[PDB]
Coordinates of C-alpha atoms and ligand atoms in Angstrom, one line a residue:
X1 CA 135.8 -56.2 -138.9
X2 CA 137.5 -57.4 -135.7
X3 CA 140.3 -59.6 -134.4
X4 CA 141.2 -60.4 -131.1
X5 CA 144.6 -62.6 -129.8
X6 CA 143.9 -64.1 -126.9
X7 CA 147.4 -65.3 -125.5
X8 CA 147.9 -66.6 -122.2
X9 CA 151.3 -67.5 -120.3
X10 CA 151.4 -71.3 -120.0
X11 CA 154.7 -71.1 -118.1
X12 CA 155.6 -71.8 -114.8
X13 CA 155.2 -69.2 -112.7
X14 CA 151.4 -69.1 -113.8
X15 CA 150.5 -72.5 -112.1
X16 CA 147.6 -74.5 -112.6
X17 CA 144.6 -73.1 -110.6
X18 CA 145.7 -69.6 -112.5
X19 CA 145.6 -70.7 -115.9
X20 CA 142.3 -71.9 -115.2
X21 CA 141.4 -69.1 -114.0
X22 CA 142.9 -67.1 -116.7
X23 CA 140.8 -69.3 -119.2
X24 CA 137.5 -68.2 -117.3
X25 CA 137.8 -65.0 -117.5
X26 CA 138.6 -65.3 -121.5
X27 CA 136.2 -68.0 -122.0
X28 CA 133.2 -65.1 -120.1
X29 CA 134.7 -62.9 -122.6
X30 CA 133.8 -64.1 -125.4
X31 CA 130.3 -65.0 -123.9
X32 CA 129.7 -61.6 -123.5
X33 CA 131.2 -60.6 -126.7
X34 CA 128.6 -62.6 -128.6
X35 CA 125.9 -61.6 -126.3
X36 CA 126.1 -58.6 -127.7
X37 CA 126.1 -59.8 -131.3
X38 CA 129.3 -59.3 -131.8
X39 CA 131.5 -61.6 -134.2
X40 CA 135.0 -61.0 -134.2
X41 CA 137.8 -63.5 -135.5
X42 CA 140.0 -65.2 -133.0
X43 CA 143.6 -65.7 -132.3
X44 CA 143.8 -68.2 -129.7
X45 CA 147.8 -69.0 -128.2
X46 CA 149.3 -70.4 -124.9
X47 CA 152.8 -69.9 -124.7
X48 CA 156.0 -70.6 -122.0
X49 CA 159.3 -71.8 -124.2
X50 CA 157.9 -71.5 -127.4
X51 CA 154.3 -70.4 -128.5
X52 CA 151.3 -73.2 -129.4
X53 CA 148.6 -72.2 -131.5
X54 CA 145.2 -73.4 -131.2
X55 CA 143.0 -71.0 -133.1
X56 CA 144.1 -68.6 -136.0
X57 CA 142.1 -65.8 -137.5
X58 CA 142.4 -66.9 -141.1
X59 CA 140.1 -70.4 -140.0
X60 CA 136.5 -70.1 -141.0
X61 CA 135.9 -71.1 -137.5
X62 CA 137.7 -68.4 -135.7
X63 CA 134.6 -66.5 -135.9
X64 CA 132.3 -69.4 -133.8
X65 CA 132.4 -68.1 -130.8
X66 CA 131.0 -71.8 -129.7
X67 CA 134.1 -73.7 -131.4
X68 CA 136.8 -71.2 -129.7
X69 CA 134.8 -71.8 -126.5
X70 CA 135.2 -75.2 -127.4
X71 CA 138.4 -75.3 -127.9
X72 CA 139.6 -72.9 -125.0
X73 CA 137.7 -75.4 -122.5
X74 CA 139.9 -78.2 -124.0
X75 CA 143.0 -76.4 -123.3
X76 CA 145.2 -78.4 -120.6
X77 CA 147.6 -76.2 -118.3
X78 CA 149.8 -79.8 -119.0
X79 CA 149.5 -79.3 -122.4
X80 CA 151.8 -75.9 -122.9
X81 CA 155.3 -78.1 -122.8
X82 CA 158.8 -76.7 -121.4
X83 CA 157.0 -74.0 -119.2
X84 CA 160.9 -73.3 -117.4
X85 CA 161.0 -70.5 -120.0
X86 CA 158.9 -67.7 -120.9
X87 CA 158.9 -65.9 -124.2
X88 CA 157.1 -63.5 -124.5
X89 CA 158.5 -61.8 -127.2
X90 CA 157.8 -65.3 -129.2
X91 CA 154.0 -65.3 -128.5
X92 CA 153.3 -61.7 -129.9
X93 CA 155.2 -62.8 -132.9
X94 CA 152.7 -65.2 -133.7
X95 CA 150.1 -63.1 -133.2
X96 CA 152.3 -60.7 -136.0
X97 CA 152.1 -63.8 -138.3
X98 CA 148.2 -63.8 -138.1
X99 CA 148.1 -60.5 -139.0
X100 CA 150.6 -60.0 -141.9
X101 CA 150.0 -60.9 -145.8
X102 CA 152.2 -63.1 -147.8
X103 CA 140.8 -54.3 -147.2
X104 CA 143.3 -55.0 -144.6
X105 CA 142.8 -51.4 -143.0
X106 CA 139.0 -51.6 -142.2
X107 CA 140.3 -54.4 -139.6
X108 CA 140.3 -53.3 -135.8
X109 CA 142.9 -55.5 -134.1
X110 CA 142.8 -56.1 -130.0
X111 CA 145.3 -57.8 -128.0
X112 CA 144.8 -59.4 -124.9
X113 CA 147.9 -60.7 -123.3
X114 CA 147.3 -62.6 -119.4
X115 CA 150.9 -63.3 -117.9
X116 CA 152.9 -62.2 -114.8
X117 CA 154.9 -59.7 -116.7
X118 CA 158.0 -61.8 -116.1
X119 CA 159.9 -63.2 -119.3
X120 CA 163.4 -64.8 -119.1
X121 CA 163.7 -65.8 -123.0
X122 CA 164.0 -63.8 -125.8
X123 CA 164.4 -59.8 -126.2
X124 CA 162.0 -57.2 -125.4
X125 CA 158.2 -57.7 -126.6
X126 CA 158.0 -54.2 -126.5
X127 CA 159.7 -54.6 -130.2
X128 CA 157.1 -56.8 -131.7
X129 CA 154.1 -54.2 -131.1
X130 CA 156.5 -51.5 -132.8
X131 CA 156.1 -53.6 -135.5
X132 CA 152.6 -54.3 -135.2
X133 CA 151.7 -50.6 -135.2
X134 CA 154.2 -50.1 -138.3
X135 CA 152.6 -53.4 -140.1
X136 CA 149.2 -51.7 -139.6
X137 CA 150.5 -48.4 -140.0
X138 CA 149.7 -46.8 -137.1
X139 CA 150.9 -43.8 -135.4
X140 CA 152.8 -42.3 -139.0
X141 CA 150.4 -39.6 -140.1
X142 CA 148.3 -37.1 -138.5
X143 CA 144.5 -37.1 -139.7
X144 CA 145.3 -41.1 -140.0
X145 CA 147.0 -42.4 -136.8
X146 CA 144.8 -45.1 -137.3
X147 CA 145.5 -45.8 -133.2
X148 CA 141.4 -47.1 -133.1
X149 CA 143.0 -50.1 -134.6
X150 CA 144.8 -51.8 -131.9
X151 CA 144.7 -52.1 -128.6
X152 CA 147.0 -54.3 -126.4
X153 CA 145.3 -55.3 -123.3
X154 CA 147.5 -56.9 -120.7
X155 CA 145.8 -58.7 -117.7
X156 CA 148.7 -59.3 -114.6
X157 CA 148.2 -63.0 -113.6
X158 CA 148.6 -64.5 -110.1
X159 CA 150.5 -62.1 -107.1
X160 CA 153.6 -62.1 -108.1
X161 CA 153.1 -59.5 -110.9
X162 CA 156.0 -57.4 -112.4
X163 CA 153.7 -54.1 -112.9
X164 CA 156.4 -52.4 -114.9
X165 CA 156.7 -54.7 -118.1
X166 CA 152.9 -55.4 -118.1
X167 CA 152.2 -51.5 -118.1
X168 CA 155.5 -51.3 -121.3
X169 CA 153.4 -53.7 -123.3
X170 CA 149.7 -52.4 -122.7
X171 CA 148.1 -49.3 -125.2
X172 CA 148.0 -45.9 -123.9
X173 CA 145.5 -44.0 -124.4
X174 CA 143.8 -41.4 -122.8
X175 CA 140.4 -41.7 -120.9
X176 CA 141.2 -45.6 -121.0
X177 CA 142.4 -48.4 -119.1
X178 CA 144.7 -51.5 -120.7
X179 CA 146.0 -52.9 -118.4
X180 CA 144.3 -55.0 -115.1
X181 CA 145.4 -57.7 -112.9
X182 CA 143.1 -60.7 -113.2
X183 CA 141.7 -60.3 -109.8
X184 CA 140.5 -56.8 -110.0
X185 CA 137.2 -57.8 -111.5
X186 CA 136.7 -54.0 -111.7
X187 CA 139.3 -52.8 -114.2
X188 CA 138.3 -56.2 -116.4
X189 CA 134.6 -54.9 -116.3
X190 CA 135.7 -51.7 -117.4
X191 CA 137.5 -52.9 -120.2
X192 CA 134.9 -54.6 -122.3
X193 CA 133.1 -51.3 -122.2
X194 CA 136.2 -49.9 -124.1
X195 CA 136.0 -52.7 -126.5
X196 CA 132.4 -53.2 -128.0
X197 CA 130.4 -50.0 -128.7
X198 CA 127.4 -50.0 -127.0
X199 CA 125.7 -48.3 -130.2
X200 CA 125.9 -51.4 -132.5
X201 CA 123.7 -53.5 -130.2
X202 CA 121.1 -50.7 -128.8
X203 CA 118.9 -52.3 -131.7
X204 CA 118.8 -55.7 -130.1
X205 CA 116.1 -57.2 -128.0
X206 CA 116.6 -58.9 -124.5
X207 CA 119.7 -56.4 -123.6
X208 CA 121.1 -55.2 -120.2
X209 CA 123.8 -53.2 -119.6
X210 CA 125.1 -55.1 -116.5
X211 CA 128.3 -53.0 -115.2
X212 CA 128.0 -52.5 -111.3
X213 CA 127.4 -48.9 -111.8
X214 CA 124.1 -49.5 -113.5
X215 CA 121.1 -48.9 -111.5
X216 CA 117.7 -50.3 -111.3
X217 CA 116.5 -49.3 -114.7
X218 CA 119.8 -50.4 -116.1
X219 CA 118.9 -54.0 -115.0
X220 CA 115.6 -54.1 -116.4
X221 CA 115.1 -51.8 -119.5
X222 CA 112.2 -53.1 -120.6
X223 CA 110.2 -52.8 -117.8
X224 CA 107.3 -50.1 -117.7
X225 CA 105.0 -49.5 -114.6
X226 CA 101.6 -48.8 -115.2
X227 CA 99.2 -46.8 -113.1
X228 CA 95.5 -46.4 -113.7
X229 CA 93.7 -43.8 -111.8
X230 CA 89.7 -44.5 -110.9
X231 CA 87.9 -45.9 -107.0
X232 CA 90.5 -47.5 -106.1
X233 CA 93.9 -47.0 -108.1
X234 CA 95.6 -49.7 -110.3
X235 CA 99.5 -50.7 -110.4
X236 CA 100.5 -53.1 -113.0
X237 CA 103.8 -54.0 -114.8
X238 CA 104.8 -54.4 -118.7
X239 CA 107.5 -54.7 -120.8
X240 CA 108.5 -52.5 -123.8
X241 CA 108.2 -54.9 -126.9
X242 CA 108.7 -52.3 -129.5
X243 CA 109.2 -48.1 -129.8
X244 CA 105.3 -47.6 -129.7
X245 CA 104.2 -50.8 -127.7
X246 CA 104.0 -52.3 -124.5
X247 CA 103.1 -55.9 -123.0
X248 CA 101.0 -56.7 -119.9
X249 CA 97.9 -57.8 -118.5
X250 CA 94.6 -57.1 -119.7
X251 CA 92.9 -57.5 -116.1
X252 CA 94.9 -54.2 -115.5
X253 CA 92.3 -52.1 -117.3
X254 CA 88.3 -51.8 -117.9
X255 CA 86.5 -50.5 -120.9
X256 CA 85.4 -47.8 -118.3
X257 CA 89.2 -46.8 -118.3
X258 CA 90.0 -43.6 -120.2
X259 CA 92.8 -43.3 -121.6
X260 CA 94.2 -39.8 -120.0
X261 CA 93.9 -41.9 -116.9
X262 CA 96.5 -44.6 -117.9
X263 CA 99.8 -43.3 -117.5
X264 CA 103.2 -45.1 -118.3
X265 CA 106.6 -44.5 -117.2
X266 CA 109.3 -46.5 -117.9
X267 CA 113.7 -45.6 -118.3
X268 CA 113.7 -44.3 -114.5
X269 CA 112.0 -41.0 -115.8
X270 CA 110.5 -39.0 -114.0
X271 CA 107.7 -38.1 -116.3
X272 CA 105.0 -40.2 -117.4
X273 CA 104.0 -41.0 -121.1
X274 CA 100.6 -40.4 -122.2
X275 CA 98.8 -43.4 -124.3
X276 CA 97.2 -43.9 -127.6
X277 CA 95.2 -46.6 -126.7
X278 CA 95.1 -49.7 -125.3
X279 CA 94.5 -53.4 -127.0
X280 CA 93.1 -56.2 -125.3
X281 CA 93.6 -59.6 -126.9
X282 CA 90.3 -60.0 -128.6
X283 CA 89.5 -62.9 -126.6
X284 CA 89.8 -62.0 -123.0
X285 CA 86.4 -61.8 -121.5
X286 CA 86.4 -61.5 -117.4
X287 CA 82.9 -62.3 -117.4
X288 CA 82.6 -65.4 -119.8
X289 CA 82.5 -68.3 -117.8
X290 CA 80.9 -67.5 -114.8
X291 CA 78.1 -70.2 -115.7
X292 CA 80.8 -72.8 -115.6
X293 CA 81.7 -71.9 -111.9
X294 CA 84.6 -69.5 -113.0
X295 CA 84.0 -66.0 -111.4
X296 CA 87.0 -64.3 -113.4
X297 CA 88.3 -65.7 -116.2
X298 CA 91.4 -64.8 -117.1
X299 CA 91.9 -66.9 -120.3
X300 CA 94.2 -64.7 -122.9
X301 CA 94.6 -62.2 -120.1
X302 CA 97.2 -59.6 -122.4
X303 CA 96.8 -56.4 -123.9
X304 CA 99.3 -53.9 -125.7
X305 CA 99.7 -50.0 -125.0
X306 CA 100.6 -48.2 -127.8
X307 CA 101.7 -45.5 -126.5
X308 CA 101.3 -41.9 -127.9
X309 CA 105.1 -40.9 -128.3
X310 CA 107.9 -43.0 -130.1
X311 CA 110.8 -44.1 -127.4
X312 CA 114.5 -44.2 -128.5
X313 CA 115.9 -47.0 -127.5
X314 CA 119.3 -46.8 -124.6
X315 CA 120.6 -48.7 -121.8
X316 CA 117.8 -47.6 -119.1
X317 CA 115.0 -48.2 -122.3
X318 CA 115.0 -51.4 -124.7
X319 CA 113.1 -53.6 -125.8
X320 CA 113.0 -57.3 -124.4
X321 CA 112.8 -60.3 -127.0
X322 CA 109.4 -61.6 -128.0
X323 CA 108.8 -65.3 -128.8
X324 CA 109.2 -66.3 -132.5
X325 CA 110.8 -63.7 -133.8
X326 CA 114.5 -62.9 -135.7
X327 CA 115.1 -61.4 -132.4
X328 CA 114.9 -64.0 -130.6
X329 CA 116.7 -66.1 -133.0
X330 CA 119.7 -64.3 -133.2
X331 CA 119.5 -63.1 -129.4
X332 CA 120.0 -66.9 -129.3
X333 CA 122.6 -67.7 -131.6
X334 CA 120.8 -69.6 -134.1
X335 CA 120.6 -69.9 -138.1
X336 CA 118.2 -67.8 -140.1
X337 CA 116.5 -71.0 -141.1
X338 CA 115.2 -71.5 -137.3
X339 CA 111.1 -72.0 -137.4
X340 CA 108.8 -71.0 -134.0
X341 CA 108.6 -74.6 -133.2
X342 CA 112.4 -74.5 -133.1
X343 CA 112.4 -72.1 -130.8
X344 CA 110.0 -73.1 -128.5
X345 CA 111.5 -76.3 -127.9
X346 CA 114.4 -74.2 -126.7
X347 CA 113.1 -71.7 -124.7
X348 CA 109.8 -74.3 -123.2
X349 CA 111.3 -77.7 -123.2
X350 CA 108.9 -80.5 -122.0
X351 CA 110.4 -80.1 -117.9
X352 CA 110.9 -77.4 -115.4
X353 CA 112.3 -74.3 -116.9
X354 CA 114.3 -72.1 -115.0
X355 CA 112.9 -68.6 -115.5
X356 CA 112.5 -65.2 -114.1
X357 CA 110.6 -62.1 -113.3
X358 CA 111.1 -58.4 -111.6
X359 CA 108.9 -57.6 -108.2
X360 CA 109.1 -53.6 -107.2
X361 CA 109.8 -53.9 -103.2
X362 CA 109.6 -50.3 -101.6
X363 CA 111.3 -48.6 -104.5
X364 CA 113.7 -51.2 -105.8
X365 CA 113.5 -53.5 -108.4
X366 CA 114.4 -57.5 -107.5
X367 CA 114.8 -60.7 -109.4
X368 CA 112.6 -63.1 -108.5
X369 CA 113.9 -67.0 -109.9
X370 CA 111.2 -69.3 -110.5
X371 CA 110.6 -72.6 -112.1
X372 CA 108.0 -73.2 -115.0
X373 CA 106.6 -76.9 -114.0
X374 CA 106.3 -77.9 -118.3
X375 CA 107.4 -81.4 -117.5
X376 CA 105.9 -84.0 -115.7
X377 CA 105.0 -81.9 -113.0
X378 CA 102.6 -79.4 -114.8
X379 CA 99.6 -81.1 -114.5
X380 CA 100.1 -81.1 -110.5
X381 CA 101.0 -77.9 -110.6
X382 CA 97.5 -76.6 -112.6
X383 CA 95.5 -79.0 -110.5
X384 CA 96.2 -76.3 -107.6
X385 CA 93.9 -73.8 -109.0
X386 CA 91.4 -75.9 -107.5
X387 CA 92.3 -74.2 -104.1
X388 CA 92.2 -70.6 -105.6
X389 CA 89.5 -68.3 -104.3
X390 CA 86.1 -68.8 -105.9
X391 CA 87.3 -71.6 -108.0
X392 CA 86.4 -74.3 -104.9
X393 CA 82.7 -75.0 -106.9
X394 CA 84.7 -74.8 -111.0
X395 CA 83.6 -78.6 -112.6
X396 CA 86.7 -79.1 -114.6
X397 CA 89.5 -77.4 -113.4
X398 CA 91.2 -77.3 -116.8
X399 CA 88.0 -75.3 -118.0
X400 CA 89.6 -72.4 -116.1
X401 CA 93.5 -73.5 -116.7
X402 CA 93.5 -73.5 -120.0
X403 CA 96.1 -74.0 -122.8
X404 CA 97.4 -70.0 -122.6
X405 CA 98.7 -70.8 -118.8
X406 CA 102.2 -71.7 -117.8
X407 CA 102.5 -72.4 -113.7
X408 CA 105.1 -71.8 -111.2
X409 CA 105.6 -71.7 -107.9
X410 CA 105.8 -74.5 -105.0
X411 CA 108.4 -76.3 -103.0
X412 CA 109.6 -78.8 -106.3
X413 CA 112.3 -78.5 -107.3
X414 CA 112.6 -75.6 -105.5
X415 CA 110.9 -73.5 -103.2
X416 CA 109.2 -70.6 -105.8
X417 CA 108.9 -67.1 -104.8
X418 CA 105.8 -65.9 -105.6
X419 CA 104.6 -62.9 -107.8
X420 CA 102.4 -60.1 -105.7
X421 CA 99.3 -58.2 -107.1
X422 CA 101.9 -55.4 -108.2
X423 CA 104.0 -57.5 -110.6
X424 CA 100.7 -58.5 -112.7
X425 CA 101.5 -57.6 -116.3
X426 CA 105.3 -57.8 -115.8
X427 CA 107.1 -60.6 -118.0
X428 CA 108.1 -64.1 -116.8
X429 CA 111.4 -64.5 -118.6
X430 CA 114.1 -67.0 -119.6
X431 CA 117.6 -66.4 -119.7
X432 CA 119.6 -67.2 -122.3
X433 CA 122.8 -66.8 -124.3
X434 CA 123.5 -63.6 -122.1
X435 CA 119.7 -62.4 -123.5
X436 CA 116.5 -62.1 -121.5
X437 CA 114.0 -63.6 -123.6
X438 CA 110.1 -63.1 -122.3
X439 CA 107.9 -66.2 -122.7
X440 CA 104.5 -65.0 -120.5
X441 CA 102.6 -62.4 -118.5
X442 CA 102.3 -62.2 -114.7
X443 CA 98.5 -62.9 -114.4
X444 CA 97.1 -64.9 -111.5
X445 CA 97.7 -66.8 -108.8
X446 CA 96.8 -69.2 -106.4
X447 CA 97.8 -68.5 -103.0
X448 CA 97.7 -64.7 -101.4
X449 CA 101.0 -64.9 -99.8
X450 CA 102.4 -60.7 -100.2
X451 CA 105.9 -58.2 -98.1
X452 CA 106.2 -61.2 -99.4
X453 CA 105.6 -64.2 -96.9
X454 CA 107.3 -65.8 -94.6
X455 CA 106.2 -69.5 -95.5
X456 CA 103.8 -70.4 -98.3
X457 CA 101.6 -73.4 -98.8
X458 CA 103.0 -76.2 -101.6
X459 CA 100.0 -75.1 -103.3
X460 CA 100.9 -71.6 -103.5
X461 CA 101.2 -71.6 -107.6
X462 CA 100.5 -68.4 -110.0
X463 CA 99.8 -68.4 -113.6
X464 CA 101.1 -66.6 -116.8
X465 CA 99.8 -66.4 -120.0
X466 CA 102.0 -68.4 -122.7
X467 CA 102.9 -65.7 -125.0
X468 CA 103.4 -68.3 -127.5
X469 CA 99.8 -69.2 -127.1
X470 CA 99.1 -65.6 -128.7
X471 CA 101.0 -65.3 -131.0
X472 CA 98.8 -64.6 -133.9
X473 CA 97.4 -61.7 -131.7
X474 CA 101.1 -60.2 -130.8
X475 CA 102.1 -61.3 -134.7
X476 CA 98.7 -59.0 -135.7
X477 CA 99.3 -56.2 -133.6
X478 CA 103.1 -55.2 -134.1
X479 CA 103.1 -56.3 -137.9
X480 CA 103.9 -52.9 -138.8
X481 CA 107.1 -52.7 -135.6
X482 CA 109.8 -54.2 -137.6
X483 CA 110.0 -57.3 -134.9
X484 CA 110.2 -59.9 -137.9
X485 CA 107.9 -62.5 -136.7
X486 CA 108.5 -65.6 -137.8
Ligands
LIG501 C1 98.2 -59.9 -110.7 O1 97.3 -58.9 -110.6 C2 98.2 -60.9 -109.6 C3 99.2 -62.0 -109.6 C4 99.3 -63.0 -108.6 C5 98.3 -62.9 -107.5 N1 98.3 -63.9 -106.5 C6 97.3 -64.4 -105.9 N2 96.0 -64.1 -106.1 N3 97.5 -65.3 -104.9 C7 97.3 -61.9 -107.5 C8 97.3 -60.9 -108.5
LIG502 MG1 157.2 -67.6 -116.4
LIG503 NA1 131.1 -76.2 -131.7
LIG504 NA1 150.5 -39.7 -135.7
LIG505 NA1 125.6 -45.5 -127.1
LIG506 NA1 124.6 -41.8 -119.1
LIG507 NA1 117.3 -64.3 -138.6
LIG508 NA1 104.1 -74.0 -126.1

C-alpha cells in the first residue's frame, strides 16, 4: 500500500505560468506511475494562506489515477484564494490529517512538496514532519526505523528558490536524492526511479525503461535480431512475446533452414541463443497463388521461435504486449471484463492510427512513426500493391491484399517513413497508456526506397500482417506461456 501528497504552493511568488508548470510535471507523474501498474492513493492540496483540498486518500477515487488527473487538470492558479501568504506549515498539516486515525504500518507514505521554499505564515514545517515520522513511528527503534515509509520530496519552483528551507524539509537518505528544482528535468527523472521498484513491473508486457541513461536495448526490449546463415545470409527482426517465444516473419526462413543455422540475439548480448524450432503459421504458403498472378504470397506471413533456453525477463529483455490478452488489458488500463473486440476497437479504430516500428541504421536502433490508413483511406492505400514488383499482371488486387494486411506509408496524412528489407519481422506498434502494444509484423512492401531515401513515391506503401487476424494461431501456440488470452 501507497500514498502520495501532492501539494503545490498556490501563493504568490509561484505565478501563473509556474503553477502550470508545476501541475505538468505532477500530472506526467502520475502517468508514469500508472504506466507501471502502479496504484497508489492520492492526497491532492494547493495551498498559499490557508490549505484547499481537492483529493484525500480516504476517497474511493483517490486511487483513479484518471479522476486525480481529472481533477489536477481542473485546478485553476485563480482558484487558491489569499495567495499574499504562504503557509507552509498549514499544508503539511493536512496532509498529517490524511494520515492519522480518529494495518496502518504496511502503508508507504511519499510526500511531494513543489514551492519556492519561502513561507511568511505560520512556524517551521520542519515540525509537522517530526510528527509525521512520530505518527508513523519512524526513526524510534533499531531493526524497525521504519524510514522506507516516508519520503518527503521537495521540488524548488520558479528562480527565485530559497535552497536552504527546501533542503530542511526534504528526506535524507543516503544513495538518494529528495530534493530538485522543477527545471532540472534530471534530478526529477531520478527521482521516480527511487519511488517505484522496478521489480514489481518486470512481469508486465509493453515496458521500457526510458531514463536518458538507457541505451539502445533499453528502448526496445523486446526486440530480437535474427540471422540465418545459407547462399546468401538472412537479417530479420522479432519481438520477444514470451520467456521461450519470439514473433516475426515467416518469409525469414525456408523448410531448407536448419535450425543450428538460425541464431537469435536479443538484450544487447553479445552471445547468440540457439533455437528449438521454428513455427510457421500453418497457412503461409509462398508458392500458393502463383496461378492467380501472385509470385510470392505473403498471406499469414508470421512464425514463432521457440527458442531453446528460457529468458529472464529485465530492463534490456521483456516482453512486448500481444493483442487480446490480460496484458494488454491492464497495460491499458481497462476492467477485467474487457472482450478482444473491445480492444481492438481501441488499439485499430476505423481511421489512421498512429503507430510505430524500430529500423537498425549502422548499429543504432531508430523509431520510425508511421500511420496505419484503417479509415477511409485504406482501400487507396492497398490498391497500391498494384505497382509492387510482379504484381503489375495480379487480376484482383485484393486476392493478394488480403484480410491479414494492415498498410502504411505515403504522403497522407503525413509523409510515412518506410520499413527496409532489415526491419522484416520487427513489430508495428501502437503506443498507449505509457505501454507499447504490437498490433502487426513488418512483411512487405511496395516501393524499394532503402539508407533510406531521399524522396519516395505516394505509392510507396508496406504491409504488415494484422496480428489480430491470427489470433487463433498466436492463441494455439503460446497457450501453455501464461499470456492469458482472451
Ligand atoms: C521485409 O523483408 C521487407 C519489408 C519491406 C520491403 N519493401 C519493399 N519491397 N519495397 C521489402 C522487404
Ligand atoms: Mg509565497
Ligand atoms: Na474520470
Ligand atoms: Na532508529
Ligand atoms: Na529490478
Ligand atoms: Na544494470
Ligand atoms: Na485482466
Ligand atoms: Na481488426
Amino acid at each position: 500500500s501507497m500514498n502520495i501528497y501532492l501539494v503545490l504552493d498556490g501563493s504568490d511568488s509561484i505565478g501563473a505560468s509556474n503553477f502550470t508548470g508545476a501541475k505538468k510535471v505532477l500530472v506526467n507523474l502520475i502517468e508514469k506511475v500508472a504506466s507501471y501498474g502502479v496504484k497508489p492513493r492520492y492526497g491532492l492540496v494547493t495551498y498559499a494562506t490557508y490549505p484547499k483540498i481537492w483529493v484525500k486518500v480516504s476517497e474511493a477515487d483517490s486511487s483513479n489515477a484518471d479522476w486525480v488527473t481529472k481533477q489536477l487538470n481542473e485546478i485553476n492558479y485563480e482558484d487558491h484564494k489569499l495567495k499574499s501568504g504562504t503557509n507552509t506549515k498549514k499544508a503539511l498539516q493536512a496532509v498529517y490529517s490524511m494520515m492519522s486515525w480518529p494495518g496502518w504500518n504496511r502503508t508507504r507514505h511519499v510526500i511531494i512538496l513543489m514551492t519556492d521554499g519561502l513561507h511568511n505564515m505560520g512556524g517551521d514545517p520542519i515540525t509537522v514532519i517530526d510528527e509525521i515520522r512520530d505518527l508513523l513511528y519512524i526513526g524510534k527503534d533499531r531493526k524497525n526505523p521504519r524510514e522506507d515509509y516516508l519520503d518527503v520530496y521537495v521540488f524548488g519552483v520558479g528562480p527565485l528558490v530559497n535552497q536552504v528551507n527546501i533542503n530542511a524539509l526534504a528526506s535524507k537518505k543516503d544513495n538518494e536524492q529528495h530534493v530538485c528544482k522543477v527545471k532540472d528535468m534530471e534530478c526529477l527523472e531520478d527521482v521516480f526511479y527511487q519511488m517505484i521498484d522496478e521489480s514489481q513491473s518486470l512481469s508486465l508486457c509493453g515496458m521500457v525503461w526510458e531514463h536518458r541513461k538507457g541505451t539502445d536495448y533499453h528502448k526496445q526490449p523486446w526486440q530480437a535480431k535474427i540471422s540465418v546463415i545459407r547462399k546468401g545470409h538472412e537479417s530479420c527482426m522479432g519481438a520477444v512475446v514470451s520467456e521461450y517465444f519470439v514473433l516475426t516473419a515467416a518469409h525469414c526462413f525456408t523448410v531448407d533452414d536448419k535450425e543450428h543455422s538460425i541464431k537469435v540475439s536479443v538484450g544487447g548480448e553479445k552471445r547468440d541463443l540457439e533455437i528449438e524450432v521454428v513455427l510457421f503459421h500453418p497457412n503461409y504458403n509462398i508458392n500458393g497463388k502463383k496461378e492467380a498472378g501472385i509470385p510470392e504470397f505473403y498471406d499469414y506471413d508470421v512464425a514463432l521461435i521457440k527458442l531453446k533456453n528460457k529468458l529472464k525477463y529485465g530492463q534490456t529483455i521483456r516482453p512486448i504486449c500481444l493483442p487480446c490478452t490480460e496484458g494488454t488489458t491492464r497495460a491499458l488500463r481497462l476492467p477485467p471484463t474487457t472482450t478482444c473486440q473491445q480492444q481492438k476497437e481501441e488499439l485499430l479504430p476505423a481511421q489512421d492510427i498512429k503507430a510505430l516500428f524500430v529500423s537498425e541504421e549502422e548499429k543504432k536502433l531508430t523509431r520510425k512513426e508511421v500511420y496505419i490508413k484503417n479509415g477511409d483511406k485504406k482501400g487507396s492505400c492497398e490498391r497500391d500493391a498494384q505497382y509492387a514488383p510482379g504484381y503489375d499482371k495480379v487480376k484482383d488486387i485484393s486476392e493478394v491484399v488480403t484480410p491479414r494486411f494492415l498498410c502504411t506509408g505515403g504522403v497522407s496524412p503525413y509523409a510515412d517513413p518506410n520499413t527496409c528489407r532489415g526491419d522484416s519481422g520487427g513489430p508495428l506498434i501502437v503506443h498507449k497508456r505509457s505501454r507499447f502494444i504490437q498490433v502487426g509484423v513488418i512483411s512487405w512492401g511496395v516501393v524499394d526506397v532503402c539508407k533510406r531515401q531521399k524522396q519516395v513515391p505516394a505509392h510507396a506503401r508496406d504491409f504488415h500482417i494484422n496480428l489480430f487476424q491470427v489470433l487463433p494461431w498466436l492463441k494455439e501456440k503460446l497457450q501453455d506461456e501464461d499470456l492469458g488470452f482472451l
